[model samples]
Target: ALHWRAAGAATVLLVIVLLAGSYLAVLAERGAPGAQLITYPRALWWSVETATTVGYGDLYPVTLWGRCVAVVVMVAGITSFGLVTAALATWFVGREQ
Candidate 1:
């Protein structure tokens, strides 16, 4: 049985990981040399965009460490969405039975 609580918890955890990854990237001086992250808000925006796989192109990671952080963020985002979807399916299907 998939409760909403479980899905909510996963969502919260994913957000935390994304924030941490974004901070690490900023600390590592990721992105184009001149286009580096300069503010926490901007870094957070980048993280949200990357996690959602939007890749707006306005901001991107150029350094190896930044790219690494991006990969983790991408994977985590996908996995988190998948888990949420599965949880939804379980809840609905059980109700249908």
Candidate 2:
């Protein structure tokens, strides 16, 4: 029960982080030279790609503040995803017993 709640909370937190980070990335990158993440959708895609460490080089942050936001997004993605993975693994093991 606790594990389920933890996993659910982690998922929600990751979603929130992904959205807010993408919005911030767009705001920080806008008007910057050679910024590829100018729009919300593009920023969202970049956030996902970056967070998963699958940067496709199609979009990226060219500004200092934008890069800062990217760091935050990367850390949040790693942490939350790690928690979710551990919780799911625990649940799976529990089921076997």
Candidate 3:
């Protein structure tokens, strides 16, 4: 019971962090050339898009600064996803024991 609870909270926290990180990514890449649709709302959407690695093609970042932010976000997103998956798998696979 305790292990399940802990995993649940961890998952939620991870989701929140992902949300924020994605938002930042969008802000970084939304308005630059190669992007063409940078705005607050677009940034927010793009953030989710990047964080999810969706690359929907609706918008993107062309500027160096924006690309830098995207890189950080890509790294973080990959790390976070991996860690969370490992955690969940471990917990489910008896690592909690």
Candidate 4:
């Protein structure tokens, strides 16, 4: 149904935005102090956790740029995740037809 289509679109868009964010972050902090910014895997995990509204404290955004990026990400990512979930829930709540 239209809901399913909306869900799919939102999901795909979220993923694309996430990957792009990750890649850009990697580039931005590839050679920063404490070798903390280049934490690609750590960043990825954190991003997922944030997007899903999960609480994982293993890694965090430290640098000014990192924090800014994360702030932007948390706002946008959470919004995207919420949109997708709402759309999916609406679809599932409707008839199987």
Candidate 5:
């Protein structure tokens, strides 16, 4: 229960970060010759896939700054997921004791 709250809250915060970062990346990548981040929804989708490390290849950041944001998002995702996973694991293990 406690772990769920912690993970849920962290998930919400991480989602907001993903959205804001993706929006900025889209803006930064816009108008580039080969930029795939042209719209908010597209960028959001890319961010979601990137955050989940699912990389569908349909959209991506072409600009250096945009790619930089993608890297940040990837790292954040891993970090946030790691925390939640740890909490859940601890909870499950403790339940057995």
Candidate 6:
């Protein structure tokens, strides 16, 4: 019965991670040599791409801190998607009963 709620919560968490992670990535990469995620827009783009695991190789972090944030973002993305998938599966199974 709360499957929709679970999915919604996961989505919200993912959005938060995406925004916060991007901001941190930008700050962490600031003034770093050869850093491609120094700008907010580019960092945000990279966050989405990385989170989805579909890195286009256009932007990336060259700093250790930024790389850490990227890892968190990736994990959060995977976890959120997994929760959503589980929620949908539960709903479908419940309906089959």
Between candidates 4 and 6, the lDDT winner = 6
Reference-based lDDT, each prediction = 0.80, 0.86, 0.64, 0.68, 0.85, 0.87
- C-alpha TM-scores of all predictions: 0.85, 0.87, 0.64, 0.70, 0.87, 0.92
lDDT of 3 by residue, 1-97 (tens): 6555665675576556556655655566655456643555676676567767888987777777777766665665676666667666767798456
Give me candidate 6's TM-score against the actual structure.
Answer: 0.92
What's model 1's lDDT at 57? 88
RMSD of 2: 1.6
Q: What is the lDDT of residue 9 in candidate 4?
A: 78
How do these models rank on TM-score, best leading? 6, 2, 5, 1, 4, 3
lDDT per residue for candidate 2 within 1-97, as digits (tens), equals 8877887898788788889999998888888786678899898898899888888898888899999999988988888888888987987899775
Residue 68 error for model 4, in Å? 2.2
**Which residue pairs show backbone clashes in model 4?**
none
Distance from true location, Cα of 45 in model 5, Å: 0.5
Model 3 residue 42 distance off true place after TM-score fit, in angstroms: 0.8
Query: Residue-wise lDDT of candidate 1 within 1-97, one digit each (tens)?
Result: 3466778888998999888988987876633574546567788988898888888988777778877988998988888888888888877777775
* C-alpha-based local distance difference test score of model 1: 0.80
Q: Please write out the lDDT profile of model 6 over residues 52-91, one tens digit for every residue.
A: 9998998888888888998999999888889889998987
Candidate topping lDDT:
6
Residue pairs clashing in model 3 are 30-38
Q: Give a tens-digit lDDT track for model 5, residues 1-96.
A: 777687888889889878898889878888898657988888888888888899888888878988899898998898889889989798888877
Candidate 3 local distance difference test against the native:
0.64
Model with the higher lDDT, candidate 3 or 6: 6
Better of 1 and 4 by lDDT: 1
Q: Which 10-residue window in model 4 sums to the lowest lDDT?
A: 30-39
